[PDB]
Amino acid sequence: LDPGLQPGNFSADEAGAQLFAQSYNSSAEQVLFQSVAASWAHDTNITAENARRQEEAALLSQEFAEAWGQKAKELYEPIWQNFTDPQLRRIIGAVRTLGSANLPLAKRQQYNALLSNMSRIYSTAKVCLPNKTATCWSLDPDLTNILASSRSYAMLLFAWEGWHNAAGIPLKPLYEDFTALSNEAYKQDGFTDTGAYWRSWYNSPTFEDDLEHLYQQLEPLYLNLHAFVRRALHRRYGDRYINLRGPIPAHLLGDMWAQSWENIYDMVVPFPDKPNLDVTSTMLQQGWNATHMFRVAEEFFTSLELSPMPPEFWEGSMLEKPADGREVVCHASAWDFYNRKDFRIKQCTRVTMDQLSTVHHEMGHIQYYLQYKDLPVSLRRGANPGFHEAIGDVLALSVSTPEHLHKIGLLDRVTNDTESDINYLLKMALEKIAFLPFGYLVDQWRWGVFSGRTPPSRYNFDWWYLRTKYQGICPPVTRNETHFDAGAKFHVPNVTPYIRYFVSFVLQFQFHEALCKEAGYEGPLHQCDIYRSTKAGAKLRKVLQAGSSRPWQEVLKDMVGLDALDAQPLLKYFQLVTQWLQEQNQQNGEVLGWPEYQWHPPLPDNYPEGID
Ligand SMILES: *[C@@H]1O[C@H](CO)[C@@H](O[C@@H]2O[C@H](CO)[C@@H](O[C@@H]3O[C@H](CO)[C@@H](O)[C@H](O)[C@@H]3O)[C@H](O)[C@H]2NC(C)=O)[C@H](O)[C@H]1NC(C)=O
Ligand SMILES: CC[C@H](C)[C@H](NC(C)=O)C(=O)N[C@@H](Cc1ccc(O)cc1)C(=O)N[C@@H](Cc1ccc(O)cc1)P(=O)(O)O
Ligand SMILES: *[C@@H]1O[C@H](CO)[C@@H](O[C@@H]2O[C@H](CO)[C@@H](O)[C@H](O)[C@H]2NC(C)=O)[C@H](O)[C@H]1NC(C)=O
Numbered sequence: 028l029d030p031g032l033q034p035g036n037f038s039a040d041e042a043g044a045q046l047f048a049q050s051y052n053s054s055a056e057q058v059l060f061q062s063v064a065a066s067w068a069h070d071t072n073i074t075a076e077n078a079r080r081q082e083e084a085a086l087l088s089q090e091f092a093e094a095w096g097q098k099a100k101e102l103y104e105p106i107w108q109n110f111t112d113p114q115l116r117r118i119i120g121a122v123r124t125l126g127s128a129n130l131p132l133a134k135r136q137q138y139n140a141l142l143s144n145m146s147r148i149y150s151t152a153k154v155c156l157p158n159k160t161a162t163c164w165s166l167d168p169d170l171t172n173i174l175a176s177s178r179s180y181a182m183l184l185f186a187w188e189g190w191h192n193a194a195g196i197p198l199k200p201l202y203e204d205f206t207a208l209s210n211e212a213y214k215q216d217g218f219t220d221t222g223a224y225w226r227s228w229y230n231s232p233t234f235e236d237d238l239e240h241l242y243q244q245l246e247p248l249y250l251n252l253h254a255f256v257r258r259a260l261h262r263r264y265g266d267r268y269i270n271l272r273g274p275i276p277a278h279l280l281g282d283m284w285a286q287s288w289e290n291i292y293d294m295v296v297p298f299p300d301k302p303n304l305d306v307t308s309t310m311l312q313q314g315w316n317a318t319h320m321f322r323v324a325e326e327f328f329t330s331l332e333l334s335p336m337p338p339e340f341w342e343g344s345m346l347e348k349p350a351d352g353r354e355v356v357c358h359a360s361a362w363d364f365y366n367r368k369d370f371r372i373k374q375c376t377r378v379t380m381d382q383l384s385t386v387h388h389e390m391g392h393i394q395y396y397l398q399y400k401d402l403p404v405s406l407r408r409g410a411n412p413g414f415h416e417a418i419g420d421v422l423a424l425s426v427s428t429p430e431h432l433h434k435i436g437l438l439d440r441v442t443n444d445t446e447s448d449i450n451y452l453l454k455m456a457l458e459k460i461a462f463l464p465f466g467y468l469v470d471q472w473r474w475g476v477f478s479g480r481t482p483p484s485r486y487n488f489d490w491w492y493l494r495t496k497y498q499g500i501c502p503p504v505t506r507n508e509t510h511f512d513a514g515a516k517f518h519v520p521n522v523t524p525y526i527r528y529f530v531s532f533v534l535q536f537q538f539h540e541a542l543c544k545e546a547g548y549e550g551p552l553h554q555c556d557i558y559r560s561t562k563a564g565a566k567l568r569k570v571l572q573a574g575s576s577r578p579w580q581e582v583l584k585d586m587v588g589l590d591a592l593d594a595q596p597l598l599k600y601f602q603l604v605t606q607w608l609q610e611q612n613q614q615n616g617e618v619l620g621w622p623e624y625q626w627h628p629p630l631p632d633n634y635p636e637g638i639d
């Protein structure tokens with residue numbers, strides 16, 4: 028790539044490996060910077076030239092990783108793993124893994140070009156109306172808003188079917204080629220497949236057993252929530268479109284992927300007439316904008332004596348969807364340019380309660396970057412990716428409490444009684460409990476694809492098996508193997524792992540319990556607010572500053588006092604609504620689960636032409 032960035036002479040000792048690590052990280056910052064810079068230029072401004080520059084930067088990275096990774100094994104292949112320094116062998120281990128740099132140039136370009144094509148197709152896909160193909164809808168905000176607020180079966184379906192056909196179908200041939208190239212690359216590193224590489228980041232010999240054990244404890248909660256919500260949908264949409272012993276049609280839960288259910292809170296509220304805990308209409312009434320939401324988030328972090336967002340963030344970030352007519356990736360993201368200075372968020376922010384927590388979630392990533400920027404490049408990661416995803420969510424739990432919402436002016440009164448307490452915990456259940464099966468299943472699908480279990484001829488078949496098995500949902504229309512419904516979820520074509528979200532959703536409640544203890548708080552865990560707790564903030568600062576220097580299991584014991592992940596804090600948090608939901612399901616004579624697994628709803632009568 029460039030002589031200055033290539034490695035020189037180092038001895039085959041542990042002492043030389045320390046010198047090797049320092050020279051690697053120094054040159055790496057420059058390589059990562061141009062790569063992240065070119066990705067930013069593309070994702071905020073999607074064109075052919077920016078894609079070309081993106082791919083050109085991707086090649087240089089692979090050239091860098093090859094030279095240093097090849098030189099690492101040359102010097103340290105047999106002797107590494109036997110070093111006394113835990114931090115060193117972690118760094119050296121990551122360096123010898125070349126990834127897509129194991130491929131020849133011809134295949135490197137194919138690998139890099141596929142990523143850009145899959146990314147381009149996903150973010151530029153549109154849904155046009157069939158009769159008057161003029162006003163085509165994008166995913167964000169148009170289809171997102173339709174799925175959130177529309178209560179028309181036909182309209183919801185048209186949006187769901189349109190998006191899955193638009194994104195999915197053209198992605199399939201490209202995703203097949205990527206999977207083969209990805210496996211070829213990571214097999215030369217000694218992994219069975221790419222999936223095995225992804226799972227290794229959690230450095231646990233019994234990882235799949237642990238996750239499976241956690242979900243078994245969490246399944247009863249989802250089953251009761253599922254049943255209760257199914258009953259409410261039955262009353263709304265009727266006996267034809269809802270089967271009380273079958274799976275719920277996947278377009279009715281208020282979300283394109285049915286990943287979180289908060290948008291149907293109004294339909295399923297236990298005790299209505301009380302102050303609406305969805306503060307979205309108040310935000311719009313008071314005139315909240317994107318800039319307000321990020322600053323409200325920032326203030327929460329600084330109240331814990333964590334770092335404020337630097338000048339570069341406010342200068343560089345994209346906090347609203349451009350009105351220039353530009354084509355942008357609207358999926359929210361948090362950016363580290365590896366120059367210990369430039370940090371940014373790219374978000375097509377809408378003024379809504381769930382977006383306010385998304386803002387917190389994205390700012391949690393940034394806060395992480397800010398806390399470990401002084402560490403060496405290889406250690407600028409979370410203890411595991413799940414830690415990175417859980418920081419912003421932990422604070423959001425405090426923020427969402429009716430007491431805190433009152434303090435920031437979004438809720439006029441909170442009568443502390445049993446009925447308000449059930450209203451809130453159900454709302455949080457629709458956000459947190461509903462997601463668990465989806466967070467768990469996405470990577471199970473991908474682990475099967477990478478391992479060869481799920482060939483192209485079974486992509487959709489295996490996707491909907493897992494969707495039905497875990498979420499208890501069915502496709503609102505018939506699907507075959509021309510469709511590729513997994514590709515209609517951002518993370519699949521953008522090749523970024525999803526298991527971190529299941530880990531994060533379990534872990535954020537372990538964190539929340541630990542911080543409320545250190546805040547000196549007592550009483551029900553779901554009414555805790557760590558706002559302005561410098562003591563709780565000093566606990567968070569230490570884990571964030573650790574980065575990836577210490578193994579996540581020991582980092583977790585210093586914080587929570589336990590070696591591993593644990594479902595108890597999550598169960599403790601929700602206990603009251605769990606008992607309440609079981610009570611209600613028994614009184615309604617509900618069947619938990621979906622015994623009629625084959626059932627699918629019929630089409631609307633004049634769909635699509637006529638209904639529009
Ligand atoms: C809303 O109502 C709930 C239910 O009554 C309140 O929970 C109760 O809060 C009080 C005061 O914080 C807790 O008192 C504490 O009890 C422990 C004993 O475990 C004691 O060591 C402390 O010194 C303190 O006296 C009480 O435990 C707690 N009840 C339960 C069942 O957890 C809640 O505080 C109310 N929320 C608001 C904002 O007023
Ligand atoms: C093109 C660069 C990426 C956008 C970025 N990488 C860098 C070096 O800034 C990155 O992976 N950021 C992670 C948050 C994250 C970052 C690092 C971690 O170790 C873990 C999480 C992130 O923003 N994830 C988001 C989803 C996402 C993930 C990857 C993308 O390319 C785009 C969006 P979120 O989970 O907040 O919905
Ligand atoms: C979007 O990217 C394109 C390039 O892919 C940018 O277009 C160039 O802009 C520079 C700077 O003004 C001009 O000198 C070039 O003539 C343009 N080239 C082409 C091919 O159009 C464009 O500026 C970017 N848009 C934004 C808002 O940054």
Ligand SMILES: *[C@@H]1O[C@H](CO[C@@H]2O[C@@H](C)[C@@H](O)[C@@H](O)[C@@H]2O)[C@@H](O)[C@H](O)[C@H]1NC(C)=O
Pocket residue numbers: 504505506507508509510
């Ligand atoms: C896959 O399905 C395609 C379209 O689906 C069919 O027609 C639409 C309008 C709906 O009525 C739906 O229920 C039907 O299944 C077919 O055109 C295509 O041939 C199918 N692909 C394969 C390989 O069979």
Ligand SMILES: O=C(O)CSCC(=O)O
Pocket residue numbers: 286385388528
């Ligand atoms: O809602 C979020 O952003 C957190 S869950 C991850 C996802 O979006 O798929």
Ligand SMILES: [Cl-]
Pocket residue numbers: 228412413524525526527
């Ligand atoms: Cl992950």
Ligand SMILES: [Zn+2]
Pocket residue numbers: 388392415416
């Ligand atoms: Zn995230």
